[PDB]
Each structure stands twice: as C-alpha cells, then as structure tokens.
Amino acid sequence: PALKLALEYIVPCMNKHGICVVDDFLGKETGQQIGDEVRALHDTGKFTDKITWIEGKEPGCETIGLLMSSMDDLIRHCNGKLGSYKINGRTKAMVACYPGNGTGYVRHVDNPNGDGRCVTCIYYLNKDWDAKVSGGILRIFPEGKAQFADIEPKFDRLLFFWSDRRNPHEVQPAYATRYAITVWYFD
C-alpha cells in the first residue's frame, strides 16, 4: 500500500508541484482516535498558535506513534526519488492548536536558513471543517506559479510540501479550534 501510494502519487506529484495532498490517509476510525488523543493532551494543560512535541512512546500518544510510523513507511518507499533527496530522518511530531480566536500564523518559510529539513508533512484532524465560516486555510505560494494554493485543514488529510523557500506559506486566521500534527524530514 505504501509502495503504491509513494511511487504512483507522492513522488510524481511532489516532483511536479512541490505540494501533495493525500485525503483519507488513515481512515475515519484511526483518525478520530488520533484526534481524541490530541484533544486530551490539550485539555490536560500540555501545550505552550500553541504546540507540544511528541516522540511517539509517551502516554496518551500510541496512535500518534502509528501515524508517525505510517508517514515513515511512505517516505521510506519513496526510494530516494522525492526531489532526489536521500532522506535520513525526521523530527519528532509537533502538535499544533490554533484556539479559534482569530489567530493564525503569518507567511513564513519553514527552513529559511539552510538546515537539512527538506519535506514538511502535516496531518490534519478537524472534522466537518467549515472553511467559509471557520477560516484557518493553509495558503502556499509555490515558487514559479503565479497562483497560490489553498489547502483546507480537513480531517484525515495528509499533506507534503518542500520546506525551503520554494514554499512560503501562511495559516489564515482561524475562528474555530484547529489541530494539526507536523513532522519535518531531513536529508
């Protein structure tokens, strides 16, 4: 399954566009589970835009580990073909919560200063996101296109994009609680 998705979709889509959306990545059950785990971290005080870092062995986080393992399976089966990068690892999972008070994240590049992070991978957990009323769109400005790309933070959506200056991006103001989990893979 990872072989097929990696080589029939993620590799070609990324090499062409530098951005790749995989809807329905883990399915509604496992999704909801990860979502219930992120919410339990949050409501029990464990955020510090607020964030918390997770390795994947800590408590209340088993299924976030399964997510990370599932992401890793995709990247491993890209076979060094994704942007001709030989990927050597990734960060821990960064869980982010925009509380829903109009806050967002201003336009930025993830790796502006030349660290080894090459691919940003984000998994979204927001069921029945009403983007027209709730805001919180991810807007990416891919270098070499005169049109931006708008990505809704939809439940069980996995997203890949190049981390460097090819992809300046912003989280537009969010008016409902918005959750996402990011890892960065490095070459």
Ligand X SMILES: O=C(O)CNC(=O)c1n[nH]c2ccccc2c1=O
Binding residue positions: 108, 110, 169, 178
CA quadruple 77, 79, 81, 86: dihedral positive or negative? positive
- Residues annotated in the binding site for Fe cation, as ranges? 108, 110, 169
**Which whole-number Å values give the CA distances from 2 to 8, 15, 163, in the listed order?**
10, 18, 22
The residue behind tokens 């979502």 is 35
The CB-of-8 to ligand X minimum distance in angstroms stands at: 25
Give the chain's end-to-end CA distance (angstroms, integer).
24
| x-marked contacts with Fe ion along 104-133 as a string, rule CB under 5 A | ------x-----------------------
Query: Checking DSSP bridges between strand 89-90 and strand 169-174, what pairing results, if any?
Result: unpaired
| x-marked contacts with ligand X along 47-86 as a string, rule CB under 6 A | --x-x-----------------------------------
Contacting residues toward ligand X, per CB under 6 A: 49, 51, 96, 105, 110, 122, 138, 153, 169, 171, 180
